[PDB]
Amino acid sequence: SISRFGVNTENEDHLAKELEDLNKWGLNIFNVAGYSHNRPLTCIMYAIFQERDLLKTFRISSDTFITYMMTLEDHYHSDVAYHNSLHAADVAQSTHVLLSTPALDAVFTDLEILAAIFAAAIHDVDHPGVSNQFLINTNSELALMYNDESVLENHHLAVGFKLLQEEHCDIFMNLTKKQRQTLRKMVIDMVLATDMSKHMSLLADLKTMVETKKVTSSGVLLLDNYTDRIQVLRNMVHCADLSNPTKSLELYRQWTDRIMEEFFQQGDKERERGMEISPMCDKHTASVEKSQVGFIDYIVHPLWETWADLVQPDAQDILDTLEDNRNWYQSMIPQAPA
Ligand SMILES: Nc1ncnc2c1ncn2[C@@H]1O[C@H](COP(=O)(O)O)[C@@H](O)[C@H]1O
Numbered sequence: 001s002i003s004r005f006g007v008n009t010e011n012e013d014h015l016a017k018e019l020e021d022l023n024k025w026g027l028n029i030f031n032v033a034g035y036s037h038n039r040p041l042t043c044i045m046y047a048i049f050q051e052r053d054l055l056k057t058f059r060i061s062s063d064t065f066i067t068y069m070m071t072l073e074d075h076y077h078s079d080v081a082y083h084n085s086l087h088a089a090d091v092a093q094s095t096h097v098l099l100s101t102p103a104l105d106a107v108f109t110d111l112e113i114l115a116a117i118f119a120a121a122i123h124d125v126d127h128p129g130v131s132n133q134f135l136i137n138t139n140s141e142l143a144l145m146y147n148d149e150s151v152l153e154n155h156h157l158a159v160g161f162k163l164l165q166e167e168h169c170d171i172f173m174n175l176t177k178k179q180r181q182t183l184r185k186m187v188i189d190m191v192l193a194t195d196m197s198k199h200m201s202l203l204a205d206l207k208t209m210v211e212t213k214k215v216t217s218s219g220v221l222l223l224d225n226y227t228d229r230i231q232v233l234r235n236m237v238h239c240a241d242l243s244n245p246t247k248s249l250e251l252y253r254q255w256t257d258r259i260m261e262e263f264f265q266q267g268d269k270e271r272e273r274g275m276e277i278s279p280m281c282d283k284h285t286a287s288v289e290k291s292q293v294g295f296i297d298y299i300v301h302p303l304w305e306t307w308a309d310l311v312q313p314d315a316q317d318i319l320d321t322l323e324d325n326r327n328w329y330q331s332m333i334p335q336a337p338a
């Protein structure tokens with residue numbers, strides 16, 4: 001309820017204004033955090049579940065849901081500049097919008113929809129603000145536990161599911177044993193897919209599927225087998241995760257400031273511990289503009305272009321914004337003549 005959020009009517013009214021964009025790409029999650037005592041993930045997730053009647057469908061009481069979500073959100077580190085609950089909220093809301101794209105209407109079951117949004121919400125939980133390689137190079141206990149493979153991603157999953165065991169936190173209590181098994185499988189698949197080292201193989205396989213792309217009498221995509229549906233969900237969450245550059249510049253710029261702050265903080269930690277600094281972690285040798293252009297050209301654009309193709313023409317506006325932002329940064333690159 002509104003009381004669990006500690007929000008008064010004045011801020012509840014502001015929040016109502018902001019939530020008018022719940023199903024839109026233009027929602028401003030920064031404003032949402034500001035009116036919800038900085039609990040953007042729980043607030044947006046509650047709004048999303050209400051909007052999709054997921055609480056009613058899976059018999060999750062508001063009590064259990066809010067208790068779990070508030071617990072999960074508290075396990076995101078508010079001192080980590082980018083990988084915090086604000087980023088998770090953004091990704092969950094972005095996934096929520098992508099799931100409603102015309103080209104995918106009626107394609108996914110409710111359990112698959114539940115799985116993708118949940119995956120998005122927990123995908124970076126308890127992130128330390130440093131990369132897998134940093135954990136590996138410092139002989140971190142986490143790296144040793146997971147044998148240097150998708151260290152953080154494996155940890156995000158373990159924490160997300162482990163927290164269901166705390167008091168009044170099992171939001172999957174009323175799902176059948178079969179549903180829980182299937183949801184777990186799907187969630188694990190999608191979160192492990194957020195590991196950037198799997199990006200290329202994801203894109204490749206994604207393009208391939210687009211070659212075999214099948215539609216209907218209306219333009220709606222056809223995916224009758226699990227394997228094909230999970231590949232789309234997997235890529236959908238990956239796209240939402242990498243959606244910053246496709247948002248209105250006012251938002252994209254705030255995300256970029258955060259990702260750069262987090263990179264510099266890791267650079268500070270490397271210096272503090274006598275380790276050699278990482279690329280783009282050196283606040284004195286990193287070029288924000290150039291980095292963003294490179295990130296879009298080599299990773300984000302190639303990804304969204306393929307997604308745009310799969311859901312043609314649903315994502316066209318997203319691709320255009322992406323391109324405008326890319327050119328804005330391109331022209332923003334500093335210049336020193338003679
Ligand atoms: N705007 C951006 N510029 C450069 N790198 C980014 C940007 N947005 C996300 N990333 C990177 O994408 C990786 C995957 O995102 P995440 O799942 O949140 O960890 C992050 O670890 C960042 O290093």
Ligand SMILES: [Zn+2]
Nearest residue numbers: 123124194195
């Ligand atoms: Zn991640």
Ligand SMILES: [Zn+2]
Nearest residue numbers: 087123124241
């Ligand atoms: Zn993320």
